[model samples]
Target: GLEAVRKRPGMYIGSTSGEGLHHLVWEIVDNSIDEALAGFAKSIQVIIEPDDSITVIDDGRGIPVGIQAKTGRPAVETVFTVLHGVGSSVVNALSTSLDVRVYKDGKVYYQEYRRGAVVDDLKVIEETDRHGTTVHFIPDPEIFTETTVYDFDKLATRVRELAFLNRGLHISIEDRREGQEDKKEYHYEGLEH
Candidate 1:
């Protein structure tokens, strides 16, 4: 996986500059949200405030949080530390920040990770009669060597796609790039960006 990422970082992410680095962050964010679209969550959030951080919240049920039958650690922790994590309780972290919430069967589970490491392995931080998952992430400044700033037009395109495909999904992007408006929301009606 690392080989693939290294070999075709350009092809997959377009460039190796700061923009490309930032693109990787966006890609990961989109992937988790896509999982929500698959009925795993109801809503997700991405926070680009204070830091180049992102958070996604979902109302769908969460992945299992029990311990892995094989490893002794929590399934969520295994996913976060290991190269690849999956299944009911598996979790994995990328170079950027990520928080996953799953609300299912009228319960909520929470997990947080940094650079593919489980800082907060899948643990139920809160409980609610409602079901859903929320994710929060902050990209690693060290790995993102090139840049940390985000580009509006590029992010806008991503917002457009989520709006078109998700339809009912309320996808929003807020950019607080210095000296700019604090609240810049990108929302669309069903099937609109």
Candidate 2:
């Protein structure tokens, strides 16, 4: 899949433009929102890191960690291994690096990838009380050479609008780039509005 995306990235993301780069972020966010929509998550945190990496944290039922019957691997592992066939498929293929951490059942499962290939197998890193998932990725500059930076104003407006539309959902975006330690959040309680 990585090879395919490298050969024909336009087939997955349309193009390597700024819009395509941002679409990658939206793909991940939409996954989290889907969890929320399914009554699994209530709050989500999106952080634009200083290293050009984007991190998404959700306080929901994390990815299932049990072994998959067909693949004989952890479910989390299978997801990344087979992301190519999924709707948000191109993300891992277009990313220079991606790390996923799932906090569930009092333990944390971590996995790392580079261009849709596993850097390491999923393993337990530590114990945690929280339950959710965190995805951090740095886009490949060579592929998205047209733009390295994302439009904060555009992203923030869209996220705020998403929260408004999804009652009981809390979404926050933090811009941690240089000279822009700005933060915005929205929470809709579903009623009493």
Candidate 3:
């Protein structure tokens, strides 16, 4: 449970320092990276919102929305709720709030969670041609502390590495925090660096 992470702090993310704080973002983005690795995603966008929340958007087959047999909830819900389910599950557990939007089969599914618990019922927001998934989460302030602010250069560096390592993958990191309009994007057509 998140309470356990709140209590221990160091075990799950390896300390509540800047490394641990940024690890949360990486955890969520890594899911999209996996999608790209599987040849399903061509582009990944990571935005640092003005509120400091991180939003990762990818153009790939969205997360499954079908009912999960064991949990009786949508597969997407199960992913974030189940402790050992996936990496995003851990990000949800540690974030103050999390939102997942899936665009697939001409439909949009929206879900929100607070501290890893569902805050609203899953709703069919609209029908759209967009096809991909977006995960937005605000890291828990209590856990990351008042001084916690993700380093832009550090994040961009990692994303650039991911793009180069995964040929044909385009990854962009954007900072929309106040007084900052900086952005970095990397695109590679092949693995030759």
Candidate 4:
């Protein structure tokens, strides 16, 4: 379904350069921002893992885990695979692996994807009171030939800007890449804007 997108990445994600590489992170974060805008979320954490993977966690009501009538797939699964237009789908299509977790209704649901395809059925891994979504993805080196690395300063600056634009919302970006650990948190009051 996404072979077209994989072949012509620029048509779907602007460009496959460093800019488009960062766009994947931006698209995923924008979903969390939607929750923040709707007043159901407060904090978002962005981490650049040691293996160069990106993990985004948001304290919003987790994505619906119920079956979607049309595709008979869980709503969250449909969100990634069936909805191949953009956002998480593009990120998934371009990633070597994408691990997703949803904490909702006192349970933690999990799923893993390899190159945009679901590896297994969505299943509960544990129970928890915390509620939100967690997505960790490793960019496919083949697609990001220019560079699979990220500039911490650039990501942190954009994270700060996003927080400022979304007043009262807390956002943090950190680099866990060995020898390059750096972090910055941002939150701006509406009154100041």
- Candidates in order, TM-scores: namely 0.66, 0.94, 0.94, 0.96
Query: Which is superior by lDDT, 1 or 2?
Result: 2
Clash pairs (backbone) in predicted model 2? none
Residue-wise lDDT of candidate 4 within 31-104, one digit each (tens)? Answer: 99998988988999999999889999999999899997888889999888754414888888889999999999
Show where candidate 1 strays beyond 4 Å. 1-16, 40-42, 85-115, 120-122, 182-193
Query: Top model by lDDT, which number?
Result: 4
Against the true structure, whose TM-score is highest? 4
lDDT of 1 by residue, 1-193 (tens): 3334433455545666777655654554565566667866445454466565655444545545677779877654554455441311111223455666666555566666655545654556666787654555555555556776766567667766766667666666666556653433444565352
lDDT of 4 at 174: 92
Clashes of 4: 0
- Local accuracy of candidate 3 as per-residue lDDT tens digits, 6-118: 66667888868788889988888888988888889899999998887899999999999999778788999887877661667778888889999999999999999987889
Q: What is the C-alpha local distance difference test score of each model?
A: 0.54, 0.85, 0.86, 0.89
> Which window of ten consecutive residues has the lowest lDDT sum in model 4?
78-87
TM-score of candidate 1 relative to the true fold:
0.66
lDDT of 4 at 83: 49
What is candidate 3's CA lDDT for residue 188?
84
Sorted by lDDT (best first), the order is: 4, 3, 2, 1
**Deviating ranges (above 4 Å) for candidate 2:** none
